[PDB]
Design a protein around this ligand. Structure first.
Ligand SMILES: N[C@@H](Cc1ccc(O)cc1)C(=O)O
Ligand SMILES: N[C@@H](Cc1ccc(O)cc1)C(=O)O
Lengths: 322, 322
């Protein structure tokens, strides 16, 4: 059985935090193109920099020949993912989340190729299966496969159940089951055998792997990208004015470009690997170049140009200089 | 504010294990007739001796002028109450539980008066509201009011979460919420302000009291009957052939009468208080009578006659001597 080098290549860029059965996954990836997915919840009417790395990773997989499935949480966005969060997420109305789902779906589309043959991307929405599912059916057919003792031990919610200065509603405690079933559903419908996601998604992903095995007897895999951090210890993507949105109407291309130009020297080369498609060879040469040029580093300018184009296209890049 | 003596009278018979705000409840009972309820789950196609004390207590309340609501768990019977149970309850099909609900409803009817004016009994089925409820609606509108830290601390499920030789599914962990909402629903629809139940139901009942307050801002009450025990320490209502069913086709009136005749001297007087409507004065006189008669105690014969008539009527009592 041949072994794919895609996981190793992503590791080189520092984009692999955790992965299940790496050897088996690499072998499966070599067998041929697979369908994979990543989900994004409508916690606002737009995604932000916090969602970018995983989103671009879907494209990295598609570039390797695999088929990306971008799921927008029409249902999970009505529940709220408590994973590594201190307090309960605000509950939004069905009417509002429905509109946000539509905006996010349209925002995600340009990032992937939906017209490149069999590995063309697919848009999904878990409201399709949870929006009309009866409560008893959920509690029985899905809930019977979940152990509360195990759920309580998930690191993602351990704090909420241990720290006396906080707690977790039954609402958010149930989230893990929804994302878990999502994996099983996508496996059944589209043959999805891999789910990727942010660093805080490990537990939600493994619950999906276990449920897929319990429900369909299929072995699926999971991979999380690392927590994007800044050398100075502050939260990435967070500014005085709030988050850096991918929506041009919320955060202008000009402002977006300015955010990247402001990248610290300590983080710029790492960020080039996380947010762009430049080869590792090119990035390493660029770092060496800046090291001995005696001039201002051109890494920030290259990073800003690269990401701005990926997020807002040539037009946005042009608007960044006006 | 006047105070009712109904709770005190039930205490005299040893039928009160726990009660919430006894003083306030007694005052409310004195204000006028109230609607109360007790639920019974379709875990089989018939109820058994384990359900009798609470069932007869509904009648004791009706005799005092109150209105009894007998709820059959069309929905909860599809989930399973884990309260003080060592292992998961078997999951039955919707088709089968539906039929059991019908049989149990008909079995319960004769025990209460459905034609005695405004305090006439009412039959209820929680499938009415859970059978078509969407999962997201349940998790949000009901689930948001439940703290997992609190749920984990309920004595009814503590063992399942502490003992390494057992565990609890998300399915059964959610039961508490269903019975909890049942109380709120019955309060809203029929003005039910009191729920009574077996000793193992305290936690399910208090969750209902809290949710009724959170959802409708109404103060409701709860009362549990004690665990029926036998002096020899063995389980009451359990025989070598299984349970003692209330269904004549499962346990004949003759066999039912024989079960009571077999009552131990140590338990017979206590059982007369739990299972019959004889006055405390009459029962006490009977115990004294047997104490100094020098003859076989007539308590067992009186108990058998009383309960057999309550459960199978005059016809069953007649069949017990043939
Ligand atoms: N839980 C993910 C989003 C997600 C939703 C549904 C899924 O199936 C997968 C992922 C997040 O909070 O970002
Ligand atoms: N849980 C109770 C039955 C019940 C069902 C629904 C209720 O609303 C109340 C009680 C039992 O196991 O006996």
């Amino acid at each position: 059985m041949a072994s794919s080098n895609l996981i190793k290549q992503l590791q080189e860029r520092g984009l692999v935090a955790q992965v299940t059965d790496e050897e088996a996954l690499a072998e499966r990836l070599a067998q041929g193109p697979i369908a994979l997915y990543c989900g994004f919840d409508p916690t606002a009417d737009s995604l932000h920099l916090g969602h970018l790395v995983p989103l671009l990773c879907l494209k990295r997989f598609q570039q390797a020949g695999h088929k990306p499935v971008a799921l927008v949480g029409g249902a999970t966005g009505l529940i709220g993912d408590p994973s590594f969060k201190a307090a309960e997420r605000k509950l939004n109305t069905e009417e509002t989340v429905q509109e946000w789902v539509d905006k996010i779906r349209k925002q995600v589309a340009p990032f992937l190729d939906f017209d490149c043959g069999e590995n063309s991307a697919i848009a999904a929405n878990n409201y399709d299966w949870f929006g009309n599912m009866n409560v008893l059916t959920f509690l029985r057919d899905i809930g019977k496969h979940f152990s509360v003792n195990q759920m309580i031990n998930k690191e993602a919610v351990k704090q909420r159940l241990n720290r006396e200065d906080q707690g977790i509603s039954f609402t958010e405690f149930s989230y893990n089951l929804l994302q878990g079933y999502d994996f099983a559903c996508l496996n059944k419908q589209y043959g999805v055998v891999l789910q990727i996601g942010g660093s805080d998604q490990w537990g939600n992903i493994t619950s999906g792997i276990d449920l897929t095995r319990r429900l369909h007897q299929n072995q699926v895999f999971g991979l999380t990208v690392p927590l994007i951090t800044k050398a100075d210890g502050t939260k990435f993507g967070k500014t005085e004015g709030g988050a850096v949105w991918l929506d041009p109407k919320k955060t202008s291309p000009y402002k977006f470009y300015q955010f990247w130009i402001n990248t610290a020297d300590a983080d710029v080369y790492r960020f080039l690997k996380f947010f762009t498609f430049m080869s590792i060879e090119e990035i390493n040469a660029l770092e060496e170049e800046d090291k001995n040029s005696g001039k201002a580093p051109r890494a920030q300018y290259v990073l800003a140009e690269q990401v701005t184009r990926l997020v807002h296209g040539e037009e946005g890049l042009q608007a960044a200089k006006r």
